[PDB]
């Protein structure tokens, strides 16, 4: 019954979503031609959450691409598994985003977002009992933040009763792609903290540290990073596709995690992440999957939880396991690390178990924490913002497109008060 529509904003979001759809197609057992060639019926019992039967098995994904150039769209078509999306959903302008927040939120947004809303509304009305929205984008660009964030706002205003998952690749200081990343990040979080319901925050710094330490890769190109982000977004919502011993809907996860309506930024990791060499030696049972889950170096975020406190955690296990074992694991972890936890919330950990492990693996787990140490990214981005806003550097490219200083100050103040809200509870 319940289903999720998906949107891939910008180049980063588009490639992450393409890998996500490859992962989902592999898990559900369908060919790149669209036909079903899996093995069991538990997967095709609930494919309607992400796919639609078109004509005789040619399942079509329920996602919409979105950018301002045709090159990325052509790349995703030419890549494997790119021959399944509906061509009516390849919405894209032609002029060029220019990695500019104004150019992706005030001109090209105003010239293409009526169409993107039209197609997403068509899909959301084709699907019967909506459950939420899923969006993939980066908070360091122009059309990653502008286009995607304006779409988030419009969709929130139009369907203000559906849980929303926005997956945001926040900029990281060491991997500095462009020059206006702090500006875009500020102007994007200003709207996310106000409209969108939860963003899972990820970063390339930790996505590389994981690949260098745990995976022990030699030359990790973007394929492996997108693979990890996929394997996270695939297991974020499995209680829908597959039965479970203790199910957990997306709304249940949201209500257990978010204590106050403005503390909804989730820092996420996945287990097990075993190197190709040491996997044959490694042992995989619950009281080491949980140890790696709470390992501070497995987190896909450059904010060590030992620098803050945990408000709430969520552990989604996959596979046939022992629920009492899981619960004693969480309890003894809390008692061992009582200091890292908030006092006025008993049993800060919500645990869920699903009955179908991923392709090949026999046990798996996903961690979603709401720690108050995530204020570090916002503090750093605000510092990088105010390093440039004192001298109005690179500001005429937004002033000429029609944004004052008032909204910049608003966004910076929003970040500052958000940091204050995290810090006060801690």
């Amino acid at each position: 019954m319940r289903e999720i529509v998906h949107i891939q904003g910008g180049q980063c979001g588009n490639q992450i979503g393409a890998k996500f759809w490859e992962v989902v197609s592999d898990e559900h057992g369908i060919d790149p031609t669209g036909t079903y060639h899996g093995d069991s019926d538990l997967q095709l019992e609930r494919i309607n959450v992400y796919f639609n039967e078109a004509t005789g098995g040619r399942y079509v994904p329920r996602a919409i691409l979105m950018d301002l150039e045709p090159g990325t769209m052509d790349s995703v078509r030419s890549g494997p598994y790119g021959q399944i999306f509906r061509p009516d959903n390849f919405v894209f302008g032609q002029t060029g985003a220019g990695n500019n927040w104004a150019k992706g939120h005030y001109t090209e947004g105003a010239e293409l977002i009526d169409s993107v809303l039209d197609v997403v509304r068509k899909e959301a009305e084709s699907c019967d009992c909506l459950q939420g929205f899923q969006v993939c984008h980066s908070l360091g660009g122009g059309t990653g933040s502008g286009m995607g964030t304006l779409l988030i706002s419009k969709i929130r205003e139009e369907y203000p009763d559906r849980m929303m998952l926005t997956f945001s690749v926040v900029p990281s200081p060491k991997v500095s792609d462009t020059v206006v990343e702090p500006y875009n990040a500020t102007l994007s979080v200003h709207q996310l903290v106000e409209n969108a319901d939860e963003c899972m925050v990820l970063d390339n710094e930790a996505l590389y540290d994981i690949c260098f330490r745990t995976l022990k890769l030699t030359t990790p190109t973007f394929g492996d990073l997108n693979h990890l982000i996929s394997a996270v977004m695939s297991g974020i919502t499995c209680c829908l596709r597959f039965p479970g011993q203790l199910n957990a809907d997306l709304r249940k996860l949201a209500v257990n995690l978010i204590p106050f309506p403005r503390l909804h930024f989730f820092m996420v990791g996945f287990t097990p992440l075993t190197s190709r060499g040491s996997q044959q030696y490694r042992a995989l049972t619950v009281p080491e999957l949980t140890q790696q889950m709470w390992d501070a170096k497995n987190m896909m975020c450059a904010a060590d939880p030992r620098h803050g406190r945990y408000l709430t955690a969520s552990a989604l296990f996959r596979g046939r396991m022992s629920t009492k074992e899981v619960d004693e694991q969480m309890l003894n972890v809390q008692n061992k690390n009582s200091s890292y936890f908030v006092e006025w919330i008993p049993n800060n950990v919500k645990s869920s178990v699903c009955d179908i492990p991923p392709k090949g693996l026999k046990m798996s787990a996903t961690f979603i924490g709401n720690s108050t140490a995530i204020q570090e990214m916002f503090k750093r981005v605000s510092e990088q913002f105010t390093a440039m806003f004192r001298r109005k550097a690179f500001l005429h490219w937004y002033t000429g497109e029609g944004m004052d200083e008032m909204e910049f100050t608003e966004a910076e103040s929003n970040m500052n008060d958000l940091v204050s809200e995290y810090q006060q509870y801690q």
């Binding site: 100050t409 608003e410 103040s413 500052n416």
Partner: protein, 52 residues
């Protein structure tokens, strides 16, 4: 038929002029209100650093 056309044209012209003048007035008023709300937002943001 001449009476028909004359009356309908008169109604169309009066609707035209009403709509145009009213739209201009609303645009001016909305500009004033936008200035006012920007002022209030600046005051709200500024009073954060003020001591008690």
């Amino acid at each position: 038929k001449s009476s028909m056309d004359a009356f309908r044209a008169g109604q169309a012209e009066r609707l035209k002029q009403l709509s145009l003048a009213s739209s201009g007035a609303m645009e001016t008023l909305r500009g004033k209100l936008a200035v006012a709300e920007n002022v209030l937002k600046l005051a709200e943001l500024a009073r954060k650093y003020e001591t008690e």
